[PDB]
Amino acid sequence: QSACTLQSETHPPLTWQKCSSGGTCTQQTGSVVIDANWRWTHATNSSTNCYDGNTWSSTLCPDNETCAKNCCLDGAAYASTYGVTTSGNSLSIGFVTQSAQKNVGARLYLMASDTTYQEFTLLGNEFSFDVDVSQLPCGLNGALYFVSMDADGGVSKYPTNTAGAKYGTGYCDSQCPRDLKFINGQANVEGWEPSSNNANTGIGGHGSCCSEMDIWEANSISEALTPHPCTTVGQEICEGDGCGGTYSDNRYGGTCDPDGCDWNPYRLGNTSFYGPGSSFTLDTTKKLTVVTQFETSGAINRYYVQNGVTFQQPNAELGSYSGNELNDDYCTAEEAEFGGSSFSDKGGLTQFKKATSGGMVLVMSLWDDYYANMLWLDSTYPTNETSSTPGAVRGSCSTSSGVPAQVESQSPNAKVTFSNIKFGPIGSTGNPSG
Ligand SMILES: OCC(CO)NC[C@H](O)COc1cccc2ccccc12
Ligand SMILES: *[C@@H]1O[C@H](CO)[C@@H](O)[C@H](O)[C@H]1NC(C)=O
Ligand SMILES: [Co+2]
Ligand SMILES: [Co+2]
């Protein structure tokens, strides 16, 4: 697709700190851009929609190529349409925003310039941020994560995409998402099926796969840390049910691991570590700091800080694994005790290390889950299981929780605030900010 300018595109600014082994940090100035799926897609020479509700224009978009030629993405009113605001080093994302229409959530990328994504090489480094999850109830996910996207949003590989990173093109993740309206400079109208339960979405004939590092998927009740390897590291189109992932009949057929090697302290047995109020180690009514370290072995270490008190990732025991480092032994024991072979089929942390060794794009989002009600994060899942089933209970939310229409109606003022991002060599991010 191309870009149109009926609505101006001004990326909300956002600063962050780049830290050095020598003990100082310096401020960087970036900005955030909203993903192309949230934008108005219209004809290049008029205001006629190419996509509206959950259907495409049969005349403007008779096939994927013609559609991309005829159609453009327009600019975003970040605050009044999408409930997205920044201030200095802080980003806030509202849940439901009512303007001329209702909007739910946002998926945003950190930019290096107004036309390019910021890339981060995670391996050997650590990533620190502060988060307020206090306004996130059951069924919501305030996510901070990385994916192996192209810095230009795909423009160099697919010149029929001229909109680029400036308009949030090129997304991919470990679900091989098929709800994307444009992939590889072509629309996704061919094979489009509107969502049975969402007036605004559907599933197309193509998806977009890449490696995904879920640093933070969380609400006020539950939080998880999850790497997801893919057999192709970077962004790659997939075909229909061959995609696998949540959007396909079979989730395990494809090139990505959609489950991941997840570390959720509640799921692993420490039900007192994280939750609302003073009965938990980390009180989710208050801001907290989350630090994630990518040691060169390919293992992942984690610690938290709240009110000046530091806590490592809590220790877990699972099969023959004992510790608090997310390593090969952990992931293997997880598969043995909780089930599944997706993570190891896709090459585990060794394959994942290929993603963290290269550049990844930072994503911040707030979403509700039209497929599984976020039960996989904060409830018992599958819902027919009980606590006797190992790993079934991931959080304290009811198995009835997280119905999108219900949480949208009941908690429209929900929001997440990410702030004070700091990145650099392991051991460096706790030093003074410049
Ligand atoms: O927060 C950012 C998102 C970006 O996709 N990360 C999702 C992870 O790839 C894991 O995804 C899922 C794992 C299990 C069940 C799921 C059910 C519905 C949707 C997603 C599911
Ligand atoms: C949970 O983890 C915290 C922090 O490591 C620890 O102090 C606490 O004793 C743990 N509780 C349980 C029940 O494991
Ligand atoms: Co095709
Ligand atoms: Co180690």
Are β-strands 2-3 and 41-43 bridged in parallel, bridged antiparallel, or unpaired?
A: unpaired
CB 149 within 8 A of CB 172: yes
Coil, strand or helix: which one is 312? strand
CB count within 10 Å of CB 308 equals 6
List domains and CATH numbers for the chain.
Answer: 2-434 (2.70.100.10)
Q: How much distance in Å is there from the Cα of 190 to the middle of ligand 3?
A: 9
The answer, yes or no, to whether any atom of ligand 1 lies below 6 A from the CB of 372, is: yes
Start-to-end CA span in the chain (Å): 40
Method: X-ray
Name the closest-CA residue to atom 11, ligand 1. 258
CB count within 10 Å of CB 375 equals 23
Q: In angstroms, how far is CA 304 from the centroid of its own chain?
A: 20
CB 432 within 8 A of CB 25: yes
- Give the CA angle between residues 121, 126, 132 to the nearest 5°: 115
Pocket test residue of 266, 272, 318 for ligand 2, highest count of atoms within 8 A of CB: 272
Closest among 33, 75, 67 to 51, alpha carbons compared: 67
CB 166 within 8 A of CB 33: yes
Q: How much distance in Å is there from the Cα of 273 to the middle of ligand 2?
A: 6
- Strand pairing partners for 97? 103
Are β-strands 206-209 and 202-203 bridged in parallel, bridged antiparallel, or unpaired?
A: unpaired
- Strand pairing partners for 289? 130, 305
Q: What is the dihedral of CA 154, 157, 159, 163, to 10 degrees?
A: 10
Q: In angstroms, how far is CA 193 from the centroid of its own chain?
A: 23
Known catalytic membership, residue 212 = yes
For residues 251 and 398, give the distance between their C-alpha atoms in angstroms, rounded to a whole number.
25
Which ligand does the CA of 306 lie closest to?
A: 2
Are β-strands 13-19 and 415-425 bridged in parallel, bridged antiparallel, or unpaired?
A: parallel
The answer, yes or no, to whether any atom of ligand 2 lies below 6 A from the CB of 280, is: no
Which H helix or E strand runs over 269?
none
The answer, yes or no, to whether any atom of ligand 1 lies below 6 A from the CB of 208, is: no
For residues 52 and 72, give the distance between their C-alpha atoms in angstroms, rounded to a whole number.
13
For residues 162 and 36, give the distance between their C-alpha atoms in angstroms, rounded to a whole number.
12
The answer, yes or no, to whether any atom of ligand 1 lies below 6 A from the CB of 369, is: yes
Half-sphere exposure (Cβ direction) of 83: Cα atoms closer than 13 Å: 23
Are β-strands 2-3 and 71-73 bridged in parallel, bridged antiparallel, or unpaired?
A: parallel
- Strand pairing partners for 209? 173, 236
Axis-axis angle for helices 328-338, 348-357 (nearest 10): 130
Name the closest-CA residue to atom 3, ligand 1. 143
Pocket test residue of 179, 216, 346, 376 for ligand 1, highest count of atoms within 8 A of CB: 376
For residues 379 and 221, give the distance between their C-alpha atoms in angstroms, rounded to a whole number.
9
Which H helix or E strand runs over 389?
none
Are β-strands 274-275 and 282-283 bridged in parallel, bridged antiparallel, or unpaired?
A: parallel
Q: How much distance in Å is there from the Cα of 329 to the middle of ligand 2?
A: 21
Which H helix or E strand runs over 79?
helix 78-82
- Phi-psi group of 277: left, alpha or beta (phi > 0 → left; psi -120 to 50 → alpha; rest → beta): left
Contacts of the segment 250-255: beta carbons below 8 A, 24+ positions apart: 252/342, 252/345, 254/176, 254/209, 255/176, 255/209, 255/230, 255/231, 255/346
Size of the chain in residues:
434
- In one-letter notation, the amino acid at residue 326 is L
For residues 143 and 6, give the distance between their C-alpha atoms in angstroms, rounded to a whole number.
30
Which H helix or E strand runs over 254?
none
Which ligand does the CA of 189 lie closest to?
A: 3
The answer, yes or no, to whether any atom of ligand 2 lies below 6 A from the CB of 314, is: yes
Which residues, including other chains, have CB under 8 Å from residue 362's CB and lie 6 or more apart? Answer: 109, 110, 118, 120, 144, 145, 146, 421
Q: How much distance in Å is there from the Cα of 57 to the middle of ligand 3?
A: 20
DSSP sequence for 204-237: -SEEEE--EEEEEEE-SS-EEEEEE-BSS-S-EE
Known catalytic membership, residue 217 = yes
For residues 213 and 359, give the distance between their C-alpha atoms in angstroms, rounded to a whole number.
12
Task: Compute the Cα dihedral for 315, 318, 320, 325 and give only its sign.
Answer: negative
Phi, psi of 217 (to 5 degrees): -125, 115
Which ligand does the CA of 191 lie closest to?
A: 3
Q: Which residue has the tokens 């018992």?
A: 380
The answer, yes or no, to whether any atom of ligand 2 lies below 6 A from the CB of 270, is: yes
Closest among 341, 334, 338, 312 to 325, alpha carbons compared: 312
Q: How much distance in Å is there from the Cα of 205 to the middle of ligand 3?
A: 7
CB count within 10 Å of CB 74 equals 18
